[model samples]
Target: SNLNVERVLSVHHWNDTLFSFKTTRNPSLRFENGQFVMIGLEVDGRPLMRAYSIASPNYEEHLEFFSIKVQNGPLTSRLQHLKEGDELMVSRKPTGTLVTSDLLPGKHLYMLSTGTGLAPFMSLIQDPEVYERFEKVVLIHGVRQVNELAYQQFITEHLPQSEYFGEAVKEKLIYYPTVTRESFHNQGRLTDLMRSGKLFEDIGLPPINPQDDRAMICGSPSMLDESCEVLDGFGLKISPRMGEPGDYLIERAFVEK
Candidate 1:
């Protein structure tokens, strides 16, 4: 197979089990916010690839990815062993409908994710285009514990310092992190937060109005389903890839537990 590959530059361990990897840049590749592409290593004459959302924005020179290490999963099991300077294949045609292009224009953009699902939104929040298009950007990440929220911290800390988007995104971007397993700020499942009106209160915003707000949701099936149902109650509907747009968009990370 003809595979496009880039060398791993370095890896950062967020915790005992979560990690992020930085890789060499692909100049020819251009992607919008919330797009996912294939990345992996080749073994035994076949390439092993896993779909990953690009965690860094397009303007950034280096590519970033956030992932959780699964004990015996096919891709991650091997991926966890990779070191600096290792070669990893990246697909040429990066595509996904969860991008900002899928939603209709609105005053506020709501990005909801859980665990590694926050990957794509990490790319979206850093893009200048997002702040330019929407009046406000709200990012809600629900994780198992406070420690699992490292990526959220990284984004919140640096979003206000980005050269390209800092000024516009500073007060305009808001992060509401909720942990389900431990006692923490905004503890509970996101769907429950959505249903209870706490999410809006936490962000100090009015309840969602489909006409004034656009939403992009990515996570496990259950997370998507419940959140979608709650959004539907507020008049939000699924947005498709066709030119026609809607109130919300959705994407599912790979099917590994």
Candidate 2:
């Protein structure tokens, strides 16, 4: 079978175990923010693919992805070595249930993520639709170390200066970054912050409510489960793809074997 091939446009290494890359987008490919697509590189004679969230907005001419370099990962170990002009396979199909359409209308939207899981929200936050739908948007990203808080510069500085999004970005977006392992100004597990009300207090917002707050979670299974427990305690219900809209939605960053 033939796989869709794209050329790498640029690459940036955040650390030994993490990096981000941009690639040429297929002219025909279209996707909603927060959706993911199968991407990979050719290993041996076949395509070795994994589901990766599209990190760039629909309006971006180039596609972007943030990734973890698992030492022996089937795809990542090799994927991490990619350089400019390298070719990779990007599947034509893109799908996921984490889009705005899945959640009910609300005044505020919370995008909670961990590690490379923040990728989808990168796309979502840049979208004008997200701003138009919710009066405020809060992005909460938790990583083990402060350095792993990828794209912080872009989100905090560059995005706010972007001509298309600068005005709304300043008015509607709030970024909250936390580190679990390394000591930093914001240090703690996200669950602890949410449960302790420290998160809301720091953000200067009231506690989450089912009537006015909507959330999308992307992280490890444990993070998802724990966050869901807290959200459930707040009377938030799980939103599904083909049914009634609800207060929250979640997607695993990746399936661990």
Candidate 3:
């Protein structure tokens, strides 16, 4: 019942409001990239719990997580104030179906996310199996402002530097960023871009094809719902882990606000 389970190793700032941290590895804790697990901290003798996606790869020796600071959220407001040497509790059995196994075979993998939803895909792309399984790996991250894109920038800079995916998989992975509330490179909601075929055009890829493309979506319920409708309109089917493979996959980020 003591969920003060893990000790923090270090923390790095992705931006003023975003941070990535790693904790001591739990060899017994097993999980895939896009899985969610509960985490907690004991405050005043009671545990405060919340779900967070594991942002580190399965092979890494330490567990890593990415987080955003919510103004007055139950967990994060306090969590964001922690430093190195802090302790947090992580659930033993990690679970989720927003993984690659749920999707059908395809030439390209589309990992779509908005805000902190980018956390899980950050892990998935670093896994070498991701590159081996698909000809191209495309990640699209939509954020509210340009400054909030710091995490995606970190991912882009490190993709080609990874030992497991460096030389061989370097050219196979691509990241596209869209800012919804600001005017920058691509400015619009993803659903609008998908509808106008601009998302595909910006990525230099063709429209979604059930026969040749697979997509994984993570975001707010509305974003997921609208994006799913748009992609399914182009012939994509929702994939489930317990069922046969389909062309699309989805996971909801812990925070919808």
Candidate 4:
């Protein structure tokens, strides 16, 4: 049997190392917000796949993904060059644990991401259900450079103007972008910002507490470990399995050296 296929609808390059694309939706496909699906291309007459978090809300007519270009990466080296009309294989199943259902009810939701880890949160923030569940949503993205803050304008300007999600986004969504290597208004690693009390101070919110804040973190293994430790210090517990609601959830954004 052949794997399901979807045609690329459009592509946007943020920088040499990052890009995002939208694909024609498979009408039969169904996925919850914050899920990831396997996508790939044919290399040497065989499928070369990678797990990609879906960046678009399930309500959209197309599927979207945000990606990083790995110089010698088997799939990304080629995948980054894809253009409209190109066909990419999309798996029939989508799965992940970052959805709201995995966490216990809380008044505030924090989405902490690094690099392309912002992909899944892009979907979650756009989903109406997320707004319906949490009174406030905070998205914190950390990158090495200012330009690497992908979707900055979209989240800060366009999303708030969107007819469907605009009101909620305007009222409840907060986007905080940080740069590690460059001097920016907000500058520091997420863990550092949290530990220094800068993150909470800048947002005008109290520090994360298990009783009122639920968080989802997506990033490198080191980031996950470090952020988990910080959250643990705040009395938050890790929730990785379904039916085991906890104060926080985590997913490795990618496998890196």
Which candidate leads in lDDT? 4
Query: Residue 56 in model 3: shift from native, Å?
Result: 0.3
TM per candidate comes to 0.95, 0.97, 0.94, 0.97
lDDT of 4 by residue, 1-257 (tens): 34688999999999999999999988777999999999999899889988999999998889999999998979999998898999999888888878888888999999999999999999998899989999989999989998899998999989999998799999999899989999899978989999878899999999888899999999999999999989999888888586588899999998766
Clashing pairs for model 1 are none
Model 3 TM-score (2 dp): 0.94
Q: Pick out the ten consecutive residues of candidate 1 with the lowest summed lDDT.
A: 236-245
Better of 2 and 3 by lDDT: 2
Prediction 2 TM-score vs. true: 0.97
Candidate 3 per-residue lDDT, tens place, 130-191, comes to 88889888888888888888565456666677676687456888778889888878898878
Candidate 2 clash pair list: none
What's the residue-level lDDT of 193 in candidate 2?
Answer: 96
lDDT rank order: 4, 2, 1, 3
Clash count per candidate: 0, 0, 0, 0
Model 2, 246: alpha-carbon shift in Å?
Answer: 1.3
* lDDT (Cα, tens digit) per residue for candidate 1, span 1-257: 44577999999988877899999887877887689889887778788888999998888888999887988767888888779999999988788878777788899999999888889998888887888899889998888988889665566776688686678877798888889999996889988998888889878889998899999888998888888899999888787564558899888865645
Candidate 2 lDDT, 49-133, residue by residue in tens = 9999999999988899999999797899888889999998988878987888878999999999999889999999999999999
